[PDB]
Design an enzyme around this catalytic site. Structure first.
Site, PDB file in Angstrom:
ATOM      1  CG  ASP A  25      -1.819   1.209   1.262  1.00 44.17           C
ATOM      2  OD1 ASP A  25      -1.897   1.955   0.260  1.00 44.17           O
ATOM      3  OD2 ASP A  25      -2.428   1.428   2.328  1.00 44.17           O
ATOM      4  CB  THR A  26       1.955   3.417  -2.791  1.00 43.97           C
ATOM      5  OG1 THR A  26       0.677   3.538  -3.433  1.00 43.97           O
ATOM      6  CG2 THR A  26       2.758   2.302  -3.461  1.00 43.97           C
ATOM      7  N   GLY A  27      -0.213   4.182  -0.329  1.00 42.66           N
ATOM      8  CA  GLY A  27      -0.947   5.219   0.361  1.00 42.66           C
ATOM      9  C   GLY A  27      -0.905   5.119   1.867  1.00 42.66           C
TER      10      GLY A  27
HETATM   11  C1  LIG Z   1      -1.159   8.717   7.461  1.00 40.09           C
HETATM   12  O1  LIG Z   1      -2.369   8.079   7.180  1.00 40.09           O
HETATM   13  C2  LIG Z   1      -2.225   6.815   6.612  1.00 40.09           C
HETATM   14  O2  LIG Z   1      -1.245   6.506   6.016  1.00 40.09           O
HETATM   15  N1  LIG Z   1      -3.311   5.886   6.783  1.00 40.09           N
HETATM   16  C3  LIG Z   1      -3.305   4.580   6.174  1.00 40.09           C
HETATM   17  C4  LIG Z   1      -4.505   4.506   5.235  1.00 40.09           C
HETATM   18  O3  LIG Z   1      -5.608   4.380   5.654  1.00 40.09           O
HETATM   19  N2  LIG Z   1      -4.254   4.614   3.820  1.00 40.09           N
HETATM   20  C5  LIG Z   1      -5.332   4.539   2.861  1.00 40.09           C
HETATM   21  C6  LIG Z   1      -5.329   5.804   2.016  1.00 40.09           C
HETATM   22  C7  LIG Z   1      -5.408   6.949   3.003  1.00 40.09           C
HETATM   23  C8  LIG Z   1      -6.762   7.349   3.560  1.00 40.09           C
HETATM   24  C9  LIG Z   1      -6.830   8.484   4.565  1.00 40.09           C
HETATM   25  C10 LIG Z   1      -5.559   9.203   5.004  1.00 40.09           C
HETATM   26  C11 LIG Z   1      -4.206   8.797   4.440  1.00 40.09           C
HETATM   27  C12 LIG Z   1      -4.134   7.657   3.440  1.00 40.09           C
HETATM   28  C13 LIG Z   1      -5.125   3.363   1.911  1.00 40.09           C
HETATM   29  O4  LIG Z   1      -3.854   3.431   1.315  1.00 40.09           O
HETATM   30  C14 LIG Z   1      -5.206   2.037   2.652  1.00 40.09           C
HETATM   31  C15 LIG Z   1      -6.641   1.571   2.881  1.00 40.09           C
HETATM   32  C16 LIG Z   1      -6.492   0.119   3.346  1.00 40.09           C
HETATM   33  C17 LIG Z   1      -7.852  -0.522   3.531  1.00 40.09           C
HETATM   34  C18 LIG Z   1      -8.354  -1.522   2.505  1.00 40.09           C
HETATM   35  C19 LIG Z   1      -9.729  -2.149   2.694  1.00 40.09           C
HETATM   36  C20 LIG Z   1     -10.591  -1.779   3.895  1.00 40.09           C
HETATM   37  C21 LIG Z   1     -10.078  -0.779   4.920  1.00 40.09           C
HETATM   38  C22 LIG Z   1      -8.706  -0.152   4.739  1.00 40.09           C
HETATM   39  N3  LIG Z   1      -7.410   1.683   1.665  1.00 40.09           N
HETATM   40  C23 LIG Z   1      -8.606   2.487   1.643  1.00 40.09           C
HETATM   41  O5  LIG Z   1      -8.967   3.117   2.591  1.00 40.09           O
HETATM   42  O6  LIG Z   1      -9.315   2.461   0.441  1.00 40.09           O
HETATM   43  C24 LIG Z   1     -10.632   2.869   0.490  1.00 40.09           C
HETATM   44  C25 LIG Z   1     -10.845   3.694  -0.669  1.00 40.09           C
HETATM   45  O7  LIG Z   1     -10.927   2.817  -1.613  1.00 40.09           O
HETATM   46  C26 LIG Z   1     -11.650   1.541  -0.941  1.00 40.09           C
HETATM   47  O8  LIG Z   1     -10.844   0.248  -1.325  1.00 40.09           O
HETATM   48  C27 LIG Z   1     -10.275  -0.275  -0.054  1.00 40.09           C
HETATM   49  C28 LIG Z   1     -10.950   0.249   0.868  1.00 40.09           C
HETATM   50  C29 LIG Z   1     -11.587   1.643   0.253  1.00 40.09           C
HETATM   51  C30 LIG Z   1      -3.367   3.511   7.259  1.00 40.09           C
HETATM   52  C31 LIG Z   1      -3.414   2.147   6.576  1.00 40.09           C
HETATM   53  C32 LIG Z   1      -2.094   3.615   8.092  1.00 40.09           C
END
Ligand SMILES: COC(=O)N[C@H](C(=O)N[C@@H](Cc1ccccc1)[C@@H](O)C[C@H](Cc1ccccc1)NC(=O)O[C@H]1CO[C@H]2OCC[C@H]21)C(C)C
Lengths: 99, 99
Positions: A25-27
């Site tokens: 996860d690059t995000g």
């Molecule tokens: C400094 O803050 C961070 O780094 N926070 C990280 C974080 O949350 N990163 C987010 C992007 C992000 C959002 C808010 C602020 C900063 C970044 C993303 O990279 C990872 C999540 C993983 C996930 C996948 C499935 C179910 C629940 C969670 N993906 C996601 O939320 O995706 C949403 C949108 O698309 C949908 O598909 C998947 C789920 C849905 C934490 C992991 C540390």
């Protein structure tokens, strides 16, 4: 290797002697793993994403092997729906985005 | 290009004729942008993340330019803390993970 993004980029990791599936996860700034009993001391922490914050346990200098590539860094443990490998460890295995 | 992950992978995007900064996020299935005025019709939708669920407006077949690469697809608009480019558009610009 090269990982396409048609499907969630899930890979096998090795941590604390156990094999698990995790999302590259690059995000994510940090690495967050599903509840597990890791030995040693830890520190409380809160991490946020879409929808709010969750409480986690912060473990330092944890070894993780990601598709044969070793990384050592901070790992957070808590009630996440998915095991997430964040940038703090992805940089150590030399992971890049390309397009 | 080739993007390392020592810093957040932020890029400039153009949507509805406006420029914005967004995070290239392999851990997101979908693309979610902060509240904004987009032209066209939309439908209510709910998306979940690490903290829980949020209500968003789903726009279909929206044109978005990501560092000069054009994509046309689904864009969600709502109270996300950061603009995120998800896999639904990352695949359209030919993005892959490599290590
Ligand atoms: C400094 O803050 C961070 O780094 N926070 C990280 C974080 O949350 N990163 C987010 C992007 C992000 C959002 C808010 C602020 C900063 C970044 C993303 O990279 C990872 C999540 C993983 C996930 C996948 C499935 C179910 C629940 C969670 N993906 C996601 O939320 O995706 C949403 C949108 O698309 C949908 O598909 C998947 C789920 C849905 C934490 C992991 C540390």
């Amino acid at each position: 290797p090269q990982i396409t993004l048609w499907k969630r980029p899930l890979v096998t990791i090795k941590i604390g002697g156990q094999l698990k599936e995790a999302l590259l996860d690059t995000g994510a700034d940090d690495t967050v793993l599903e509840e597990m009993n890791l030995p040693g001391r830890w520190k409380p922490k809160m991490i946020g994403g879409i929808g709010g914050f969750i409480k986690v346990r912060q473990y330092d200098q944890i070894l993780i092997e990601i598709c044969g590539h070793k990384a050592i860094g901070t790992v957070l443990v808590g009630p996440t729906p998915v095991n997430i490998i964040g940038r703090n460890l992805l940089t150590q295995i030399g992971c890049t985005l390309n397009f």
